[PDB]
């Protein structure tokens, strides 16, 4: 599923991200169209062997099984296939575990490169 730009932040504040570890609504929007154009289907190998997943594009390093990453963590306990869903519960859940973690919304690299120290509630102006 691709998603609208309300669509979305009206799904990430039902499921209650918004303010989540002080992060406003507007950061969160913001991630998803810089990591996957809003596309819960996105897929892309990285160098090590790993692969991201989804609308916030998750790591099967350490958060979900893939079952082709050798000794690596599933601290979701979710398969990665889990995360491409229409449904968006499996990858905001996991997303509270990552931002939770010590390192904030640095852990996603387009959040940090192109949302942190801009105007992020233009990702949310216009909708209700
Ligand atoms: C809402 C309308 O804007 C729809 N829109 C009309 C055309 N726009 C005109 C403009 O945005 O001022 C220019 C192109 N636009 C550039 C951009 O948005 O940054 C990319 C395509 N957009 C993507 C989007 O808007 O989400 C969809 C088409
Ligand atoms: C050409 C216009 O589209 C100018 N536009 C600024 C004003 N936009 C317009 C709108 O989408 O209504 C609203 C804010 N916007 C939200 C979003 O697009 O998702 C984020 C910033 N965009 C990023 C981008 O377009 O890739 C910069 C270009
Ligand atoms: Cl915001
Ligand atoms: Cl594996
Ligand atoms: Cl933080
Ligand atoms: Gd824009
Ligand atoms: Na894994």
């Given at each position: 599923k691709v998603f609208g730009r309300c669509e979305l932040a009206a799904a990430m504040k039902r499921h209650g991200l918004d303010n989540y570890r002080g992060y406003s609504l507007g950061n969160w929007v913001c991630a998803a169209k810089?990591?996957?154009n809003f596309?819960?289907?996105a897929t892309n190998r990285?160098?090590?062997?790993?692969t991201d997943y989804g609308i916030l594009q998750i790591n099967?390093?350490?958060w979900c099984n893939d079952g082709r990453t050798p000794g690596s963590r599933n601290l979701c306990n979710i398969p990665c296939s889990a995360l491409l869903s229409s449904d968006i519960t499996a990858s905001v859940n996991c997303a509270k575990k990552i931002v939770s973690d010590g390192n904030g919304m640095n852990a996603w690299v387009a959040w940090r490169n192109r949302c942190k120290g801009?105007?992020?509630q233009a990702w949310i102006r216009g909708c209700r």
């Amino acid at each position: 599923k691709v998603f609208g730009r309300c669509e979305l932040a009206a799904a990430m504040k039902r499921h209650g991200l918004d303010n989540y570890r002080g992060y406003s609504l507007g950061n969160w929007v913001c991630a998803a169209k810089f990591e996957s154009n809003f596309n819960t289907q996105a897929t892309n190998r990285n160098t090590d062997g790993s692969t991201d997943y989804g609308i916030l594009q998750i790591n099967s390093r350490w958060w979900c099984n893939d079952g082709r990453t050798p000794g690596s963590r599933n601290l979701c306990n979710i398969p990665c296939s889990a995360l491409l869903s229409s449904d968006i519960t499996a990858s905001v859940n996991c997303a509270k575990k990552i931002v939770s973690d010590g390192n904030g919304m640095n852990a996603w690299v387009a959040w940090r490169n192109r949302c942190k120290g801009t105007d992020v509630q233009a990702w949310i102006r216009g909708c209700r």
